[PDB]
Design an enzyme around this catalytic site. Sequence first.
Site, PDB file in Angstrom:
ATOM      1  N   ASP A  40     -47.931 -20.554  -8.818  1.00 59.27           N
ATOM      2  CA  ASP A  40     -47.184 -19.620  -7.984  1.00 59.27           C
ATOM      3  C   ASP A  40     -47.557 -18.178  -8.310  1.00 59.27           C
ATOM      4  O   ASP A  40     -47.077 -17.618  -9.291  1.00 59.27           O
ATOM      5  CB  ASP A  40     -45.693 -19.826  -8.234  1.00 59.27           C
ATOM      6  CG  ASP A  40     -44.828 -18.914  -7.401  1.00 59.27           C
ATOM      7  OD1 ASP A  40     -45.361 -18.322  -6.447  1.00 59.27           O
ATOM      8  OD2 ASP A  40     -43.616 -18.826  -7.692  1.00 59.27           O
ATOM      9  N   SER A  98     -52.783  -5.193   4.191  1.00 63.56           N
ATOM     10  CA  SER A  98     -53.661  -5.650   5.241  1.00 63.56           C
ATOM     11  C   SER A  98     -53.874  -4.534   6.251  1.00 63.56           C
ATOM     12  O   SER A  98     -52.999  -3.714   6.477  1.00 63.56           O
ATOM     13  CB  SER A  98     -53.068  -6.892   5.899  1.00 63.56           C
ATOM     14  OG  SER A  98     -53.768  -7.276   7.073  1.00 63.56           O
TER      15      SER A  98
END
Length: 330
Positions: A35, A199
């Site tokens: 994770d 992004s």
Amino acid sequence: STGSATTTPIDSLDDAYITPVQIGTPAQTLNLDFDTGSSDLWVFSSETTASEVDGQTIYTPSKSTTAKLLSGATWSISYGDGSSSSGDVYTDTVSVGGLTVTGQAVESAKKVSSSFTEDSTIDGLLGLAFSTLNTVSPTQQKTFFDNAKASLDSPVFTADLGYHAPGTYNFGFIDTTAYTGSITYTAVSTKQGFWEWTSTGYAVGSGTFKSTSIDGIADTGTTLLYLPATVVSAYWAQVSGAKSSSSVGGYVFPCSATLPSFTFGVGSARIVIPGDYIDFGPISTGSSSCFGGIQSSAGIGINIFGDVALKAAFVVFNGATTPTLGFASK
């Protein structure tokens, strides 16, 4: 040194991925959920409340000649999905794919929430976010990667998750045969303890690319792609009959649909998520309403590039002094 381990979807939907991890001496192999959005290595154990264990493999520290109680240390964690676990702490030898760390903090669960109990395939978590998020008190502990880093050939790990198929976690090297084209690296902020990056935009299907900054985290422990409501609405507007359902808990779409792809930007590069990756199947057995793999982050407080996004790429988690993230197509 290096390590290389195969990671395998737990079910037909790629709800999560498990990777075998050797703990203790002799080795006890547990299948852990790696994770990159948390920083605790915790396991079902001989200390876990018996009624909360249902099929998991447990770690038994008393059977490990290298286990030592970390005296006074406790841990308690809550995840984004509302699940939780807590317990005490041992140090022991931990190996992943041939890479060994001695003195790793292995957090032994005394209690786990129902979601963990109900998933027999996940024996615990191995956190790969920054150690500043580790929950051990009163002495915070380091992640497996942080402990391994100095010994690694290169201070990196890579995630290569499969779509409905196994994939690979590598430590200490970049497998140049595992991706196509080049890797595009992008800046990381560690301010919140995550692999947080920005992004450069998105496209829906064959549509034009929208240049827009989307801050979010690369999180292998989250199944879906959670993005701003504007972006998510633009995606689902291209699927006839798709709608947001408060009763179901997100966007659903007719199971008869063909889903468009979704592209996200990494600098000037583009990663394309095929439409099929966005299908999470019937909301309940036999239903013709299917659950979407792109969902709104509104009310999470952060955008999350979870498995839906990451499995479309070869992803480099560069833990050099100034960390960065790399993405390549594959």
